[PDB]
Design a binder for this molecule. Structure first.
Ligand SMILES: *[C@@H]1O[C@H](CO)[C@@H](O[C@@H]2O[C@H](CO)[C@@H](O)[C@H](O)[C@H]2NC(C)=O)[C@H](O)[C@H]1NC(C)=O
Ligand SMILES: *[C@@H]1O[C@H](CO)[C@@H](O[C@@H]2O[C@H](CO)[C@@H](O)[C@H](O)[C@H]2NC(C)=O)[C@H](O)[C@H]1NC(C)=O
Ligand SMILES: *[C@@H]1O[C@H](CO)[C@@H](O[C@@H]2O[C@H](CO)[C@@H](O)[C@H](O)[C@H]2NC(C)=O)[C@H](O)[C@H]1NC(C)=O
Ligand SMILES: *[C@@H]1O[C@H](CO)[C@@H](O[C@@H]2O[C@H](CO)[C@@H](O)[C@H](O)[C@H]2NC(C)=O)[C@H](O)[C@H]1NC(C)=O
Ligand SMILES: *[C@@H]1O[C@H](CO)[C@@H](O[C@@H]2O[C@H](CO)[C@@H](O)[C@H](O)[C@H]2NC(C)=O)[C@H](O)[C@H]1NC(C)=O
Ligand SMILES: *[C@@H]1O[C@H](CO)[C@@H](O[C@@H]2O[C@H](CO)[C@@H](O)[C@H](O)[C@H]2NC(C)=O)[C@H](O)[C@H]1NC(C)=O
Ligand SMILES: *[C@@H]1O[C@H](CO)[C@@H](O[C@@H]2O[C@H](CO)[C@@H](O)[C@H](O)[C@H]2NC(C)=O)[C@H](O)[C@H]1NC(C)=O
Ligand SMILES: *[C@H]1O[C@H](CO)[C@@H](O)[C@H](O)[C@H]1NC(C)=O
Ligand SMILES: *[C@H]1O[C@H](CO)[C@@H](O)[C@H](O)[C@H]1NC(C)=O
Ligand SMILES: *[C@H]1O[C@H](CO)[C@@H](O)[C@H](O)[C@H]1NC(C)=O
Ligand SMILES: *[C@H]1O[C@H](CO)[C@@H](O)[C@H](O)[C@H]1NC(C)=O
Ligand SMILES: [Ca+2]
Ligand SMILES: [Ca+2]
Ligand SMILES: [Ca+2]
Ligand SMILES: [Ca+2]
Lengths: 448, 448, 448, 448
């Protein structure tokens, strides 16, 4: 279990609105990395997922032997452990168990979540190029693996209702899932088939971030028209790209008890990878900006239960115009106008302040994470702290041109020294070993 | 415990003399590294020690937060686990437990060894520059830590007889120790004080490798005179630099039961870092070439017991002239003449063939490891397979100029597929994260 | 163990009813304080707990580094020792062991008690402002730590039955607990949820001190109506503020064996901090006056066992109208009428005479302690001796305006010189070091 | 025993000459004080002595019940314990045993020292005003008390040779003593009788600090004449005020084995209180400036042994002109000219840098401590860091006018976090409890 110094400083808003204005990032601290490196120049480690809870943490990433492209073979590394203080005062992520799922099943886009006594992981089995998954009417096989600290492993092929003949494809969002009220929730996304109930119920819906108007040169009517069209992709089998949540009851005999809960397209942008968080008793969702709006998207999720089962989800966006991501064409970090786009990168963000603490939800929110500071290239990894309109502290890593990809950020507090630490898990392009080196950068978020 | 595919292919001579002539190295294989990386540009991870036995493996290395020099602070990372096959057929070193000794005690030059149920580690506590340790008449504090898989940890400050007022300094050789007949043996080295019994008993002794004569231009009398002087260092407090073995009975209340057994200087070169091996029932020793002879030094060690206690050790060298190491001045990879030298690098070697299988011990021996291919710079890390006079297979890693340091090699066989794998743990200079990145390169040693 | 001069003069009624009329306080005596001081101007030491028994004494207090407000970080100082005579004849509290619980767990409102061979401490873990604890339906984590004189420490998270979904919050009373018939008893208080069995069973109950009638201007019916309403707080989550006792069997593997025993609201006032005492074989309880009645509240507690387990408690009040405490608004030291109040200070009192020695329980009781002599400000610390209606001896400490807070009083007798000493542990506001300086004032209670 | 974080960071020069130039004092840190407070307004706690060694620390101070003057009654508080880290990272001095010597023997001017397994304390028995001790030809009784952690206590009246009929008085210097090569050394001072061998051998000797010339307006001949006269006091029985060292072999049956070793008056100023230190293997001495030169006096002491017994001591002064002390009349902090003076205060200093590391001994020395910043009044306690000519970092405590007295400073390093902490034990005048409050201020000495 996690050390007493951390058991009470996890999954919370660590600072007050007033303190948020005076936060800065400290120097990077050196700790033994708990994320394994490749041992060949062409080895590829990508798509990490990290879940940290009161008792322990779970980590996982995908491994491909040659280069970063396969739809046949790949292995998935899973790791779990606890956090303990070092003599220097900062955290050490102690690995207590390691697993390497290597058996021929091509598990991809996996999201992992902490559960009492272990980790629950949700993956889908890839057997063809991503684009092909959208054209085929049949969805990929879905699997959830539960790995207990006692070394028992139970994997199940799941068939949640409302998937077959509704979703041409379904993928976990790769971002962490969360254990909530006896259920494990995972972010999901995919393509919905035209003519289905889901499609019809989503027809004509769209979402436009609160701060777009002042930055977009198009008129309201034009924005609305383009926003509505941004949820349909002709390149991806003419499917409605949808975001959502997969809720699974914690059982070892899962078959069709998990529930697919899609977000209303009136509250969320075009479906994309994502991540779920827990701040106290509130659930939050991070949605990758793979569409027209290039800024960080965070939402407070309200979950409704009907007869002990999740029946509906509602999302309220934290309005910002900060931390853009690199994109292609007319959808780069500089874009501000609605339209159809299918480009971007995963870059979640951690809320250091409570958006509900202001009279108007999210009027003054502070968050931290990493982002690729460029308009169209996945380059210049940069850790930062920002509010709705400005970056108030940042430090680029490496020299300009340094390639990087996804970035998963997680913060917790040492209730002993009373300082907040954040771990920025960044996929860095390496020139020595492997295509990428996923690094768990760690540093303090100083108040002052 | 290790998978059935490996429990019977550990610590043995894998090939016959005839097969040794036809061995070549396979491509590097990609597996998740079990050796942690630094998370800051200046973080320093160095001095690894690796022990692999029938049941499991133990690994450890030193961590310094800023740069690679301290005599005050440092932490020691320890890891342990097993080996299991991946779907591709090659090994995966599964970490089952991790430990980070961070408490203010500056444990250095640690050697680790596998013991039933865990790992036994031997370190010394550094409190001043190495050179100062040789001038001070008092030796550094010595410690042996036993870490059980059940998470019990027992550290003891040891005071073996014949150390105080005999050895100005004492250091573990960093190379792995071995569990032999109920005793844990570790390689050691240090400086002996003038006038002590050990000094007197070693007076006038010297060792000259069998293949030096044909390569040295000096006459026999001159060689002998210089060889005798090579065991005394004026730069290191005028001490006799000695090599040896520390034998500790496996107990949890060690105080003064460990025994310091020095090698006769008539059979070994000037003391240096080292490593102990187990090939069947025979013990072997690797001695770093920190003296005049720049070639790989391996010896078959014969241990004598008197009343259930190790009482004396004898070393028989495997005569070779292959695999030189980079050195300074007149002691570079090109030197062949006796004289006093204090330069070199750690680069052990694994015997793929039995030296005792030939009518004349070691007449035709084959070994594998890594070495820095240059005369004086720690550059061009290169994995190889060689016999007494030639390198018969090699592959440099990275481009020329690539900095590197120590190299620990270990081989084992998959009794299922019937192939031998070797792990080459090499300290590589990195430009991204940390000063060094210790990498567990792994590849097959193919017969053909 | 305590000196022979004190082993037989602890936890008893030291004077007869007749002698009580002639008691006066002696001069303060100077002894080395056994309560540690802060070393910074802003350091805060507060909430002491002191337990003294035949064999030894236990002491503890909370430490906050900056100012006196945190719900995150804080440490708890624990101390234990014995009493021995000085050459001047008076006591010296000799500390034989010290402990500083500093590990990130925010242990608050701790009560300590002497147990055979050590101390047992009961705390709750604070993670949010006190008021928030009453609104949240879930109670704070509860912990009991046993610290043996042999340095063994065992802390357990306890989950006594009837707490979850019954008590929105639960706190130790900070006053000392007592070891009674193999069980350790601690005073407790908190807020009970509406609709629970406890709530229903307490419905319509109330308590009005015997001497209120003659001092209150309201009629009987009005008093009863207001008294009933004084047990419910809208400011504190609309909970029923309850007082009680937590009984724990002396074990090192406590989980859910401790029992929560609430006082009948027909015999006790609104729940508040408190303390338990032992006078011979009788248990007594001190209840802080945080409600409408501002006078010292002491009760003789009758404990019922059913199958070797405490099953019910009954309280009989010692009727007095002496020693008021400062309060806010219409609940100052001058108030005498029932109504809802939530203000006051901790100020226990020691009974120098047996209340059961008079034909009518407590008709003539004498007690000693300290109190803040003012109507609404925590000012003018004053040690005193008083009976049911008047203060018969007192001496203010420092000049008027001197700030102070809690006061814990304990008396014992030197069976050698035959004199009674009382220790008045008072939280004094300091201007030099720290916010407060907890001082163990000691003086004699002279008969004459 | 002390925590692993400190066992290797005690009694050493922590910084290099270069780092000394960039040292500054950090904020005062709050830890539970291990020095007991008085419990009455007139209680007096004074004359502390603190010894810290690899294994543990020893502390002691004198207690007088009414005011700060007695030559009859007084008690001596002794305390011992270890150092351990708090969750905030800084030290906590954990008291593991307390003792209160209260028995009628008026032990004064006590110096304490750490010894294997306990503390050794040296006091003298006062029975009359100090001045009277110098006029009486007989010296006060001398005592050394050894207090073992196992609670065994052995006190012995000692009669070292060369004291009777040589020293009219003899006093421990109150500053800590040190355990060196099996002997416990304590600083001493007193008055020597005219006509004795010691007197004759000291005749015409004198010492003038290296930096006086440039600051004194008198010529060399005049300075020499006045310096010679500064070692004789007509006010104190016309005795030669002498400084020295008392060496006692660690035994439990001491009688006359302790040796009185006086300093040559050619190397030291007029005798005064003092303290001994250990920096590595070198012994250092601090001499209170109770004479004409008002600056901090530190000397490297060279001890000579003859037949296993200390036979002579030599002192080499670290030349400075920094950190003056308040004095009376023509001997205030502003004085620079030789002459007879008998005024000053105890204010030792800790050397953060090695004086022997410069080609010329002490050419660039850095030290830290506290001092009363005023010319003649014991006022304005101020902690500082200084070099030979300037104060490079300082922070006054409290407001101007704040009375204070002695100051004992001690520094050690956390080899885990790699930071140096210093404890400044200062006698502060208090207005609440007691005449003085001896406070163990603690803060870090930051490099930068
Ligand atoms: C490891 O822990 C899990 C979690 O409790 C154990 O799972 C139980 O498995 C049995 C059947 O094998 C179920 O009937 C129980 O309901 C499971 N427990 C629950 C409710 O989670 C698992 O058995 C443990 N591993 C072992 C066998 O020691
Ligand atoms: C985000 O942070 C920025 C920078 O701190 C805020 O901008 C400052 O706003 C204040 C007004 O209160 C001005 O006085 C400063 O001059 C602004 N900084 C500058 C020069 O850019 C910004 O207001 C914050 N956004 C919010 C309100 O969330
Ligand atoms: C080490 O390996 C080398 C290379 O295989 C051996 O050298 C060969 O020796 C044979 C004689 O049996 C010659 O026919 C080859 O021409 C040699 N190779 C060349 C051209 O270098 C060498 O003999 C081996 N060393 C030993 C005997 O251990
Ligand atoms: C310190 O004293 C306690 C009190 O006796 C010892 O506690 C015992 O612990 C064992 C298990 O560790 C229990 O089975 C016993 O029942 C305990 N004794 C009881 C009944 O109180 C403790 O072990 C002592 N410390 C040590 C280990 O010396
Ligand atoms: C509490 O103490 C007071 C003071 O000693 C008692 O008051 C005295 O009562 C007697 C009657 O026996 C009168 O003669 C005195 O004149 C009273 N003192 C004064 C002038 O106030 C009081 O009776 C005691 N309370 C009880 C009975 O417990
Ligand atoms: C506490 O420790 C001391 C230190 O060892 C013990 O002292 C020994 O006392 C005996 C006589 O009582 C001497 O003969 C030994 O030489 C002492 N030891 C030495 C050399 O220091 C002391 O006895 C211990 N307390 C007890 C009695 O347990
Ligand atoms: C003691 O410290 C002072 C302050 O750092 C030193 O004075 C400085 O000396 C340098 C010369 O190297 C000048 O450049 C600075 O201007 C001086 N500071 C000032 C303005 O006072 C002083 O030299 C140190 N004393 C020594 C040499 O030990
Ligand atoms: C943060 O820093 C500003 C600028 O010094 C200060 O005024 C403010 O009080 C700080 N914020 C808080 C309340 O911590
Ligand atoms: C190795 O290869 C050589 C060359 O083809 C072959 O002649 C020899 O038999 C092989 N060695 C053995 C016996 O495996
Ligand atoms: C206390 O003092 C009163 C007044 O002098 C005296 O009459 C009485 O006997 C004393 N009480 C007792 C019995 O100790
Ligand atoms: C201390 O600070 C000075 C000024 O920035 C810097 O130049 C110097 O290198 C530092 N001293 C050292 C060597 O630590
Ligand atoms: Ca499909
Ligand atoms: Ca040495
Ligand atoms: Ca609650
Ligand atoms: Ca005298």
């Amino acid at each position: 279990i996690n050390d007493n110094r951390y058991i009470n400083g996890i999954n919370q808003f660590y600072f007050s609105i007033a303190e948020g204005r005076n936060l800065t990032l400290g120097p990077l601290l050196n700790m033994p990395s708990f994320i394994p490196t490749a041992t060949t120049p062409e080895g590829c480690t990508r798509i990490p997922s990290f879940s940290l809870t009161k008792t322990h943490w779970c980590y996982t990433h995908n491994v491909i032997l040659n280069g970063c492209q396969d739809h046949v073979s790949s292995n998935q590394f899973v790791s779990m452990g606890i956090i303990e203080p070092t003599s220097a005062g900062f955290p050490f992520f102690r690995t207590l168990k390691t697993l390497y799922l290597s058996d021929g099943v091509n598990r991809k886009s996996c999201s992992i979540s902490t559960v009492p006594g272990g980790c629950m992981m949700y993956c889908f089995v890839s057997t063809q190029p991503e684009r092909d998954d959208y054209f085929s009417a049949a969805p990929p096989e879905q699997r959830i693996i539960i790995m207990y600290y006692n070394d028992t492993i139970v994997e199940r092929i799941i068939n949640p209702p409302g998937v077959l003949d509704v979703w041409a494809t379904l993928n976990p969002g790769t971002g962490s899932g969360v254990y909530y009220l006896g259920w494990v929730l995972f972010p999901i996304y995919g393509g919905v088939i035209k003519g289905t109930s889901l499609w019809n119920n989503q027809a004509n819906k769209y979402f436009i971030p609160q701060m777009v108007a002042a930055l977009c040169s198009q008129n309201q009517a034009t924005q609305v028209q383009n926003a509505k069209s941004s949820y349909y992709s002709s390149w991806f089998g003419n499917r409605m790209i949808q975001s959502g949540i997969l809720a699974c009851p914690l059982r070892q005999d899962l078959t069709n008890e998990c529930l697919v809960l899609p977000f209303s397209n009136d509250q969320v942008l075009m479906g994309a990878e994502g991540r779920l968080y827990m701040y106290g008793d509130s659930v939050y969702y991070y949605q990758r900006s793979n569409s027209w709006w290039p800024m960080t998207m965070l939402y407070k999720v309200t979950i409704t239960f009907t007869n002990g089962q999740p029946s509906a989800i509602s999302a309220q966006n934290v309005p910002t115009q900060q931390v853009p991501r690199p994109g292609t064409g007319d959808c780069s970090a500089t874009n501000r106008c609605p339209g159809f786009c299918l480009t971007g990168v995963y870059a979640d963000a951690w809320l250091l302040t409570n958006p509900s603490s202001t009279s108007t939800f999210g009027s003054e929110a502070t968050f931290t994470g990493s982002y690729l500071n460029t308009a169209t290239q996945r380059i210049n990894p940069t850790m930062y702290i920002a509010n709705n309109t400005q970056i108030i502290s940042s430090q680029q890593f490496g020299s300009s041109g340094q390639e990087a990809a996804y970035g998963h950020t997680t913060c917790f507090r040492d209730t002993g020294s009373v300082m907040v630490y954040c771990i920025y898990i960044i996929e860095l392009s390496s020139s020595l070993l492997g295509q990428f080196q996923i690094v768990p950068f760690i540093r303090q978020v100083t108040l002052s």
